[PDB]
Design a protein around this ligand. Structure first.
Ligand SMILES: COCCCN1CCc2c(Cc3ccc(Cl)cc3)[nH]c3c(OC(F)F)ccc(c23)C1=O
Ligand SMILES: [Mg+2]
Ligand SMILES: [Zn+2]
Length: 292
C-alpha cells in the first residue's frame, strides 16, 4: 500500500517523454514504478480513461495487481515481458496507425490482454499443474484481477460493453498460444496474398486481433540488436537454467514464426515496417554468429 500511494500521486509524463511510441522502446533502465506510469500513459493516450470513466485510484491499483501476479523468479515470462508486449501494442496502435482500424472496446481489450496474457507464468520448464492450458489459466488470473474490489477498471462499461470486452480479452489471451497462431495464420496470409483482406468481416477482424497479439507478444525479436541480445539471454536463462547452439535456434525461430507475421502486418499497415525491419536486422546478426 506504500507502493499504491507513491504511484497514485505521481505525474504521468507524456507519451513522448516516456518513448512508449517508438517500436525501439526498452525497459531496462526503468524501475517498476516507472513501468506503471508508462502503463497509465498507455491507457490515457489511447482515450481509455476518458471513454470508459476509469477512476485514477482503481487503474493504479489494477496495474499494481497485475504486476504483483507475475513471478519475479521467472527470467523471461515476467511483468517486464508483459509490460513490453503492451508497449508494442501501444506503438502498433499509434506509431503504426492501427488505432484507426479498430473500435475502442477492441483497443481496451487488446491493452488489457497484452498486459495480462502471461499472468502467473512459472517458466517454460515448470509445466506442472493439476488446447491452450496455460493461456486459459492466464485468462482466469486476468479475470480474477479485473473483479477484485478496488481493481475493477471496467465498471464504467455497460453490461453489454463489458460482455463484449471480456470476449475479446479472452480471445486475445488465448491467441498468444503459438499453436493457435500456427493453426490460423495460413488463412491470414492467404487473404493478404490475394488482396481480399477486409476488416469489416467479423471473422477477419477477430483473426487480425489474434495476429496482432502474436506480433506484440513476440516483439522482443524486432528490437535493436543490443536490446534483443539481452532479452535473448533472458529467454535462454528460462529455457536452459530453469530460472553456440543459440544463434541458429534464433534464426530458425525467426524464419518459422516471425518474418511472415511481420511481413503480413506491414502489408496491412506499412507504418509497422520497423517491426519487420527490426526482425530482419536481428536475423542478419544471429546468422553471422550462427556461422561462427
Ligand atoms: C511468449 O513466449 C512463449 C514461447 C515462445 N517463445 C520462445 C521461442 C523463442 C526463441 C527461439 C529460441 C532460441 C534459443 C533458445 Cl535457447 C530458446 C528459444 N527466441 C525468442 C525470443 O527472442 C528474442 F527474445 F530474443 C523472443 C520470444 C520467444 C523466443 C518466444 O516468444
Ligand atoms: Mg505466453
Ligand atoms: Zn508472452
Amino acid at each position: 500500500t506504500r507502493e499504491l500511494q507513491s504511484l497514485a500521486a505521481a505525474v504521468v509524463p507524456s507519451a513522448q517523454t516516456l518513448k512508449i511510441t517508438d517500436f525501439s522502446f526498452s525497459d531496462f533502465e526503468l524501475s517498476d514504478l516507472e513501468t506503471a506510469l508508462c502503463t497509465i500513459r498507455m491507457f490515457t493516450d489511447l482515450n481509455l480513461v476518458q471513454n470508459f470513466q476509469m477512476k485514477h485510484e482503481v487503474l493504479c491499483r489494477w496495474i499494481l495487481s497485475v504486476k504483483k501476479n507475475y513471478r519475479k523468479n521467472v527470467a523471461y515470462h515476467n511483468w517486464r515481458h508483459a509490460f513490453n508486449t503492451a508497449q508494442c501494442m501501444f506503438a502498433a496502435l499509434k506509431a503504426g496507425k492501427i488505432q484507426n482500424k479498430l473500435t475502442d472496446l477492441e483497443i481496451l481489450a487488446l491493452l488489457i490482454a497484452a498486459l495480462s496474457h502471461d499472468l502467473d507464468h512459472r517458466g517454460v520448464n515448470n509445466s506442472y499443474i493439476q488446447h491452450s492450458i496455460m493461456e486459459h489459466h492466464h485468462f482466469d488470473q486476468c479475470l480474477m484481477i479485473l473483479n477484485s474490489p478496488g481493481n475493477q477498471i471496467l465498471s464504467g462499461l455497460s453490461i453489454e460493453e463489458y460482455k463484449t470486452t471480456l470476449k475479446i480479452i479472452k480471445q486475445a489471451i488465448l491467441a498468444t498460444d503459438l499453436a493457435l497462431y500456427i493453426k490460423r495464420r495460413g488463412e491470414f496470409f492467404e487473404l493478404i496474398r490475394k488482396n481480399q483482406f477486409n476488416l469489416e468481416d467479423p471473422h477477419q477482424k477477430e483473426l487480425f486481433l489474434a495476429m496482432l497479439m502474436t506480433a506484440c507478444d513476440l516483439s522482443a525479436i524486432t528490437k535493436p540488436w543490443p536490446i534483443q541480445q539481452r532479452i535473448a539471454e533472458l529467454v535462454a536463462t528460462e529455457f536452459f537454467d530453469q530460472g553456440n547452439k543459440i544463434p541458429s535456434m534464433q534464426v530458425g525461430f525467426i524464419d518459422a514464426i516471425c518474418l511472415q507475421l511481420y511481413e503480413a502486418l506491414t502489408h496491412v499497415s506499412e507504418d509497422c515496417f520497423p517491426l519487420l525491419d527490426g526482425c530482419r536486422k536481428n536475423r542478419q546478426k544471429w546468422q553471422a554468429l550462427a556461422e561462427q
